[PDB]
Design a protein around this nucleic acid. Structure first.
Lengths: 167, 131, 122
RNA sequence: CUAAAUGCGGAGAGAUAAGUGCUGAAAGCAUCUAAGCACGAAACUUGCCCCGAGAUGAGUUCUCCCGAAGGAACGUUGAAG
RNA sequence: UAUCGACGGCGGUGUUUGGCACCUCGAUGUCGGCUCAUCACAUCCUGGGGCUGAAGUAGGUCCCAAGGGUAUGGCUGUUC
RNA sequence: ACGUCCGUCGUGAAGAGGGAAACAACCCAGACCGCAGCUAAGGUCCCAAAGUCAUGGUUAAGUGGGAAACGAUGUGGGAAGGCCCAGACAGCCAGGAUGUUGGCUUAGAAGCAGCCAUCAUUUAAAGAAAGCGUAAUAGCUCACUGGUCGAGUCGGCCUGC
C-alpha cells in the first residue's frame, strides 16, 4: 500500500475502476483495472494489493506515477517552449505548415493530434500547451522530427531546426 | 585413445618449455580442472604464455602436466602408411581432478587474472583453487 | 543504325565515311538513333596531317534512314545516315562547318551551340 | 487484319519491421517496455483489372411442367462458332 | 582492434576434390551447349542499413533487397 | 569407394499379440476351437472402448521436443570474505590540489604511446595518478575525505531451468 496525499486544490473521486481528478486547469478521467483495489480517502488516495509479486509492484509503480501525473496536469498543466532557428533562409512556421525550410520549395507538416493549442507568435518562441501529456509531448517531438534533415546530410552544417527550450 | 608415446619415429619439437618461476621452494597450490581432456602442446603454450605474460609482478608459476602422448594424422587417399606426425603433436592427459598450473603464492593473488586469461584458451571449464 | 554500320560525316575534320562502333548508355540488340552520342572509328579520310584513318572518337547522329513520327502524325525519312564528330570538350564538334539539316528537339532543351551552326532546321 | 501506328495504364488509406520517441516500472535514480502508447519501409491487405459455380457454403433471379400462365425440336441468318 | 592481419585454437556449409562399393551395371547411353515447360534464393548498380585506416570528399568491407533488367560477337566440337 | 577382418549388441533368421503416430530390432509379453472372467502392451476427456482417478511438485514455456563451441543482475536456491546504525558501504552536493609540462624518449606525449622511478608539499582527502578524451594541451570521472542520505549493501563459490 502506497498512500498518495492530494493537494488542497485537488479533488478526486473514484467509482469502480474509474478515477476522475478535478481542479483548475481541467479534469482527467483514467481507468486502472488490475489485481488491486484503488480507493480514495478523505485526504489520501490508497493503492495496495494483497500479494507482493513482482508484477504486482510493477503495476504499483506506474499507478502511483500516473496518479501523480494527473495531479500536476490539473494544478500546473503541461506546456513546452520551442524556438526556431535558421542561418540563411528564415523558416516561416505557421499554425498550419512551416515553409521555406533550408530553402526547400514544398513545406513540411504534421497533423495535430488530440486537441491542444500551439499558438505561435511572430517571433522566435512558440508554445504547445494542452491537457493530455502523451499528446503535448508527441506534437513537440514530431515538430523537431521533420526539422531533421531527411537526406544523407549530417548535422552541424544544417543549423535550421526548431528545438524545445524547456521540457 | 590408447595412451601413446614414441619408440617409433621422431616428430616435431616442443612448442612449450619455459617452466618459469624459481624452484628453490616447493609449494602446494594450483588450478584444478573439473573434467578429463586431451590438450595439445600448442594450446598449452598459449595458456602458459598467457599467464606468464601477466604475472610480471613476480613468478613462482609452474606446471606439472606435460604433453607425452603423440597423435598422427593422414591426408589424402589411403592404403600405405599408418600415420605421420603433423600438426597433431604431443598431447597431455588431464584427470577430472588434476592440478595443472600452480603458483607459489600466499593470499596476494594477482595471477587469478592471469589464470583467467589462460582459462579461456584451453578447451575445458577450469576452476580456481586456493588449497 | 547498329554496330559495324557505315554512315557519312557531316563536319569537316577530313573524314568521309564512318563505321559505327557502339552507343553510350544503351544496351540493346544493335542500335543508335539520332541525338545519341556514339564512339566510332572513321574508315575513309586523310591518313596524314593528324592520324585520322584508324583513330576512335565520339560522334552525334543527326540523320538516319528510319522514319520518326511527329506529334502531328507525319513521318520523316532520309536517304542514308550521317553524324558529327566531337572532341573531349564537353559536346563540341571538331570540324568548323556542318552539312545537313537538323531536328527541333535537338536544339533548345539539349544543344544550344549545335543549332547556332545549323544551316537548316526542319 | 496487321506494323517500325495510335488512345489508356493513380493517388491515397490502414497495419508492422529496422529505427526514432512518449509515459513508466523491476533497482524510491535512470531507462523506448518488461504492461501501455505516438510515429515509422518501393514490402503486407485492400483498392483496380482479368478468370471464375465441379467455389461441397457445387449460387442466384424471374418466368416456364403443378392439366396447362411455356419450353426443346423446326425454318431463314449472324455483332457466334 | 580504425582497412590488412601471421602462429594457434574452435566451428559452419558441402558449390570443389579425394574419394570407405549397402542402392542402379537382369544397364535412371556420357560432358557442355541448344531448344521447351514447371517450382526457388547465402546477389553487382540503384533503395534502406552496420563498421570504418568513417574529419569532409572519395573509397574499403559487410547485411538487406529481385522491384525491374542480365538483349550481343571472332578462334575451338569443346564445358569452366 | 554402397569393404576385408575382429569385438559388443541387435535384429533379417524361427515370432504372434501390442504400444511407440506409421516401423526389423526400444518397452512389455508369447498363438487350438467356441466361450466366460481377469490382467499385460498401451491407453483410459471426446471421436474411442476404459477415472476429465489419488498424493506432491515444477514449468507457463504450449514449452510439449534437433540443436552446438560461446554469452547472460530472466529468475529461484545454497555456502563463504569484508564493510554496517559511536552516521559507514553505495546515492546527492563540493573538492580531487602545489613543485611538476618527474626524468628520459619523442615531430609532440604536460597522470593516461613507450622506457624507469612513483618520492616530497598543504594538509580532512587528493595515487606525480585507475579510465574516457586531445595532434599535443584542455575537458570529464575514479581512487581518498567532509556534509547530507539512514539501510541493507558489496566482492566471491556452487547448483536448477
Amino acid at each position: 500500500k502506497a498512500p498518495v496525499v492530494v493537494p488542497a486544490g485537488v479533488d478526486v473521486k473514484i467509482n469502480g475502476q474509474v478515477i476522475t481528478i478535478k481542479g483548475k486547469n481541467g479534469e482527467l478521467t483514467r481507468t486502472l483495472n488490475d489485481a488491486v483495489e484503488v480507493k480514495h480517502a478523505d485526504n489520501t488516495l490508497t493503492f495496495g494489493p494483497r500479494d507482493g509479486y513482482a508484477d504486482g509492484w510493477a503495476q504499483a509503480g506506474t499507478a502511483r506515477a500516473l496518479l501523480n501525473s494527473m495531479v500536476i496536469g490539473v494544478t500546473e498543466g503541461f506546456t513546452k517552449k520551442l524556438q526556431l532557428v535558421g542561418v540563411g533562409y528564415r523558416a516561416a512556421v505557421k499554425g498550419n505548415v512551416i515553409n521555406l525550410s533550408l530553402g526547400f520549395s514544398h513545406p513540411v507538416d504534421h497533423q495535430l493530434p488530440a486537441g491542444i493549442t500551439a499558438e505561435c507568435p511572430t517571433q522566435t518562441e512558440i508554445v504547445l500547451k494542452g491537457a493530455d501529456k502523451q499528446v503535448i509531448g508527441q506534437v513537440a517531438a514530431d515538430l523537431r522530427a521533420y526539422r531533421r534533415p531527411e537526406p544523407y546530410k549530417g548535422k552541424g552544417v544544417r543549423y535550421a531546426d526548431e528545438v524545445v527550450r524547456t521540457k | 585413445q590408447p595412451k601413446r608415446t614414441k619408440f617409433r619415429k621422431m616428430h616435431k619439437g616442443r612448442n612449450r618449455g619455459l617452466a618459469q618461476g624459481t624452484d628453490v621452494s616447493f609449494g602446494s597450490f594450483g588450478l584444478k580442472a573439473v573434467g578429463r581432456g586431451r590438450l595439445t602442446a600448442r594450446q598449452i603454450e598459449a595458456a602458459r604464455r598467457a599467464m606468464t605474460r601477466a604475472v610480471k609482478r613476480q613468478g613462482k608459476i609452474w606446471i606439472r602436466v606435460f604433453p607425452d602422448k603423440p597423435i598422427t594424422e593422414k591426408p589424402l587417399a589411403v592404403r600405405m602408411g599408418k600415420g605421420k606426425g603433423n600438426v597433431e603433436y604431443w598431447v597431455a592427459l588431464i584427470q577430472p581432478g588434476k592440478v595443472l598450473y600452480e603458483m607459489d603464492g600466499v593470499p596476494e593473488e594477482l595471477a587469478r587474472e592471469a589464470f583467467k586469461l589462460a582459462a579461456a584458451k584451453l578447451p575445458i571449464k577450469t576452476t580456481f583453487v586456493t588449497k | 543504325i547498329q554496330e559495324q554500320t557505315m554512315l557519312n560525316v557531316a563536319d569537316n575534320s577530313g573524314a568521309r565515311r564512318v563505321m559505327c562502333i557502339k552507343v553510350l548508355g544503351g544496351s540493346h540488340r544493335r542500335y543508335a538513333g539520332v541525338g545519341d552520342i556514339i564512339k566510332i572509328t572513321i574508315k575513309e579520310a586523310i591518313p596524314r596531317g593528324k592520324v585520322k584513318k584508324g583513330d576512335v572518337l565520339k560522334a552525334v547522329v543527326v540523320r538516319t534512314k528510319k522514319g520518326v513520327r511527329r506529334p502531328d502524325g507525319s513521318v520523316i525519312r532520309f536517304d542514308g545516315n550521317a553524324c558529327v564528330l566531337l572532341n573531349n570538350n564537353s559536346e563540341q564538334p571538331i570540324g568548323t562547318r556542318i552539312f545537313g539539316p537538323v531536328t527541333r528537339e535537338l536544339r533548345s532543351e539539349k544543344f544550344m551551340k549545335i543549332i547556332s551552326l545549323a544551316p537548316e532546321v526542319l
